[model samples]
Target: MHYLDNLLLNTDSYKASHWLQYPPGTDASFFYVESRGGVYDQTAFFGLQSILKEAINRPVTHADIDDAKALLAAHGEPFNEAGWRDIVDRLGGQLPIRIRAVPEGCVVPTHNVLMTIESTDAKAFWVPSYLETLLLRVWYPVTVATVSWQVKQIVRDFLQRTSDDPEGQLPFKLHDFGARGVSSLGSAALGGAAHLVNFLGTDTLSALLLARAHYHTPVAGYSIPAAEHSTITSWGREREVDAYRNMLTQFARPGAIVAVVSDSYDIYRAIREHWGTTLREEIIASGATVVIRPDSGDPVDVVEQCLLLLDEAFGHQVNGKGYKVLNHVRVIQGDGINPQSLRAILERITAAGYAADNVAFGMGGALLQKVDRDTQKFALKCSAVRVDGAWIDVSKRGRLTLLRDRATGQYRSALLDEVATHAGDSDDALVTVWENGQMLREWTLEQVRAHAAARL
Candidate 1:
């Protein structure tokens, strides 16, 4: 269950000695992370300081370090005794390493720095140097947030065009069902909270915890009582109608919403024969909105077909723009909904003569586990170094861009020396969010959503 179980005992064992071999003249160096615009053109920077205290700071215990030293010594790998000892000593026997980063939820342009890293003390510079492992792990959430934001933009555009209450409907447009599909509770929390930066509907409980602990939101996301196939089919196929009716009977209170998985046996039959004809009157008088979920088949086809079926059965009302919205019923496409599939589903819904408000999307693995570092081509590189009280400009010219290019241009490296002067410019955007073994700025979920709205 420990977060660093994958690395602390093995792969990361030699980084201390490896970095100790850095040029003897390398007393200090300024390292920074940037997005290079690979799969995404921009990034919604997130998860930089979200769970560092628990994942990195608190997990690196003295006992763990002693165990690590014993393992490294037994394996006969190079061990920097003085360096590791100094790191433990500076941690005051509790903390791991002194690390710094930019504020979470900042909208960073492509190839722009999202965070910078050094150490709290002069002697411990290399102590945090190999932390590219821990620091760069932030790329996962930042990329997920960016992907979620991109989906929001698409949904927003369609909503603005088709619905009169775009603002009211936007938050519920996308829901997070990614908790079960992720690798760990940490991933669920980070990715779920990332999605919350753009919307507020989530089923990932860890995200609510992360929002409460890190983003300062006691209740970060909202969800309705929803049923899965197991709950429905367990009632047996002969009693499918009873299964559907039970959901309405249980949660269909005034102003409440209840979602039922309608595809346990026959999705089309359940929607057309059972829900449309058999339960029509009950659904209308239930005083609650019923969301029918389709968990299999092509998302676009399923959603469009489900909307048309709901329209035929429950009937629909014409919005101000003449787009149709089903009365007392809506569709939620949970399976196979991602950025591409979501847009396809929305486009098919609108093209089939229904408003985008007619259906919502629930994303699972696609929203969390499907991304990688190259989603935004995130990378960390040293930009400057200090030796004997003098600052030396440093840089690397990789295949992506030239160092001579404009500092603010896409794919160009950022100059840390220029950050002070461009403090007022929007793109000059890396703020000292973490420093001196403390968090300089902590953002609330509402504040993060507001920042996403204003910038992303």
Candidate 2:
């Protein structure tokens, strides 16, 4: 994931570091020290260049190359001009840059926009504002949210399938552990809600409020902060029974499902050798479901072993009606769980005797860290930019090449647009705050979230 090879910033195409201060209120975030300029700088402009080249399967030759360089260069390091000749040499005329997209909450398609930069400008191309890092930060959370959403949906389906009546209203008990994976507390709230919106299982207290008011998802599984951090280790020997009994007695009983991390010490040994005689019957008799959590190793392999052990050690016994008994204990996987990883585990579990829906998982990092592959990675594509007189669009290669008619004296500028799955929807429209120096309207994160939901 190192972009050491992608560093193409030159004098003509300003380094991102150049554009640290601009429109005043731009906030600084996770953009690497180099990403200060807008994507247009010949350096990161690769993302934009690649997009356009692929958009039209041909090399781009343009009289606007100089203009493109100047436009992006304008956004780079405010006034730092050490060596303009070297930059112009590397950037040259008009060679497109390669870009890789990572969509908000989803994986990105090839040639998709993480963002786009028009490699041109009025005076000379320059990188734009301190928005580069902000852009990356905005998109990374979304990627994680998308993955998280899938994890929730998968679990919901599995839960519904376990019941005889699949369509029956499922008991609401879902949580989002995305806080750990998010970039900051604020991103945890924003991106977490987006993922939770997809499946409506967010454990974050902040996200719950947003989901209720914004997303209309039913709220359930309320536990205080203390409950979240509460721990009960079933180490070995006598401690297993004591921990199980004490936790069950304290936290949950009939009609309540309590989750316990089983992999604290030896997972297989505790499940197969130790926990059976001590707590299995007691757990089942009390009508309280005990969730054995496997947080390490291959989740699929670990869960499968746990399931077989459950049946082997505590199989069927003759009931009062002469029928066989089945243990009600459920196994949930924690630690590393994502859509891709969970899908693999589900396939394995389903292949065995167990139904896919029988398993529960705790996913935080993967949900908030993965990007959806299906949607267009959220990007700010330059649509148009302001110069001297009117707002001139820095056009991609085509018949209506504005550069061809330079006689109009309309200074070439870049217009930054947005890309989304449903581009035609009103919510997907990219709103800009400036056409150059003139102010427009800015889209807040809440508005962006609402737009994401409404549009797609």
Pairs of residues at least 3 apart in sequence or in different chains that clash in candidate 1: none
Candidate 2 TM-score, C-alpha based: 0.53
Question: Using Cα atoms with residue i matched to residue i, what is each candidate's TM-score against the true structure?
Answer: 0.89, 0.53
Candidate 2 per-residue lDDT, tens place, 235-315, comes to 444576576677677855677777766666677876776567667677767777666777778777988888778767666
Regions of candidate 2 where Cα sits further than 4 Å from its true position:
1-136, 152-175, 181-183, 200-203, 209-237, 272-275, 313-327, 369-378, 386-391, 395-456
Global lDDT of each candidate = 0.76, 0.44
Worst 10 residues of 2 by lDDT: 397-406
Q: Provide the lDDT at 453 for model 2.
A: 27
| Reference-based lDDT, residue 426, model 1 | 25
Q: Report the C-alpha lDDT of model 1 over 1-456, residue by residue, as the tens digit.
A: 654552245346567467656666666666777887887777887887685545454324456667776877887766665665655566553333334444565565677656667655666566555666777888898988998898988999899899989989999989999898999988899899999999989999999998898887899999999998899999999999998899988999879999998988889999999999999899888889999998888777888889888988989889998799889999998888778888888888888778888889899999999899887888888766666766666634211111222444332344544444544432444455656456667778787787784333
